């Protein structure tokens, strides 16, 4: 089997991407944030505290003839941005782009943090990291990819995120029309539950490539590119008037600037992030200070190849017995 679904930026800055997901019988279609940095499929629901729902589409398990309460199971997750959600668990039929999993754990939110409530466009998350991070207790549950894997033509999914445009998530096949050149594969560590890999280095604009190992995660659920402070300083030093602002919470730059590109290494290959991809617009409406798309990881504890980086590539999440990541230009 295979699946193919379009992923659409939630706003004009590509702050996140939503992909329609069919849940239950008859189908209830929710727009979920596909997150290769977490392992829970959770949704706004008929159980979510009413005051915490503000425009999201909800899953109502009582209206699904295939929904089953997973008795005694609860979940609770806290994300790197400080947001959180928790609730109980159903199993139900979940389809993405034509690919169907029966008995998928659908984590029904009873509580969500303010950032979730405040974002009307995201109806929940679909985690695509390794199932070892799944928060369901007392019986840990499998991701949608882990449940689908054995049925897929090839045990892979691919992320093809658009810059200011829709893109695609494919399951079970590699669309050889979707990228240029060849796919470079690189080793993955699953020891922290993430798609964790080591970049071979970077370049700023037309600058010379610096060969240096940068361990980090491929995380579709994080907007920006978070890298060591040395690398980030080298980038923003090339932008007149750029500075790190403690009050704003990262590097800002004059909105009048033309940003340089950023290149990262994948083995001997190179992925180039155009400068425009690094512009996240005014810090506040009407400001001439713009927020940068490359930020320090120093306060995180891990480097994160988020959407800014991943949207410059066609990315293969290879779930073979030994997982690997693939990157191609496009
Ligand atoms: C409420 S929301 O904006 O829809 C949302 C979606 C997904 C995550 C998962 N990503 C994440 O935690 N990234 C961590 C990085 C960003 C900061 O700290 C480092 C968090 C929040």
UniProtKB/Swiss-Prot annotation:
Domain of life of the source: Eukaryota
EC number: 3.4.23.22
Keyword Plastid: no
Tagged with keyword Signal: yes
Catalytic residues of the enzyme: 35, 199
Catalytic activity: Hydrolysis of proteins with specificity similar to that of pepsin A, prefers hydrophobic residues at P1 and P1', but does not cleave 14-Ala-|-Leu-15 in the B chain of insulin or Z-Glu-Tyr. Clots milk
Protein name, UniProt field: Endothiapepsin
Annotated organism of origin: Cryphonectria parasitica
Portion of the full sequence shown: 90 to 419 of 419
């Amino acid at each position: 089997s295979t699946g193919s679904a379009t992923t659409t930026p939630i706003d004009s800055l590509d702050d996140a991407y939503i992909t329609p997901v069919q849940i239950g019988t008859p189908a209830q279609t929710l727009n979920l944030d596909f997150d290769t940095g977490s392992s829970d499929l959770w949704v706004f629901s008929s159980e979510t505290t009413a005051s915490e729902v503000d425009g999201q589409t909800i899953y109502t398990p009582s209206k699904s003839t295939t929904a089953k309460l997973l008795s005694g199971a609860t979940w609770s997750i806290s994300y790197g941005d400080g947001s959180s959600s928790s609730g109980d668990v159903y199993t139900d039929t979940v389809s993405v782009g034509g690919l169907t999993v029966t008995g998928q754990a659908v984590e029904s939110a009873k509580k969500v943090s303010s950032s979730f409530t405040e974002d009307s466009t995201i109806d929940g998350l679909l985690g695509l990291a390794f199932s070892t991070l799944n928060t369901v207790s007392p019986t840990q549950q499998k991701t949608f990819f882990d449940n689908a894997k054995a049925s897929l033509d090839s045990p892979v999914f691919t992320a093809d995120l658009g810059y200011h445009a829709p893109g695609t998530y494919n399951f079970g096949f590699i669309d050889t029309t979707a990228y240029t050149g060849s796919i470079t594969y690189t080793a993955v560590s699953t020891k922290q539950g993430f798609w964790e890999w080591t970049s071979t280095g970077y370049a700023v604009g037309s600058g010379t490539f610096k060969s240096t190992s940068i361990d980090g995660i491929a995380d579709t659920g994080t907007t920006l590119l978070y890298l060591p402070a040395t690398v980030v300083s080298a980038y923003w030093a090339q932008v007149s008037g750029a500075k790190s602002s403690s009050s704003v919470g990262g590097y800002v730059f004059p909105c009048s600037a033309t940003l340089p590109s950023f290149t990262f290494g994948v083995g001997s290959a190179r992925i180039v992030i155009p400068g425009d991809y690094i512009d996240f617009g005014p810090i506040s409406t009407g400001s001439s200070s713009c927020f940068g798309g490359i930020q320090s990881s120093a306060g995180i504890g891990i480097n994160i190849f988020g959407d800014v980086a991943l949207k410059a590539a066609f990315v293969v999440f290879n779930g073979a017995t030994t997982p690997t990541l693939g990157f191609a230009s496009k």
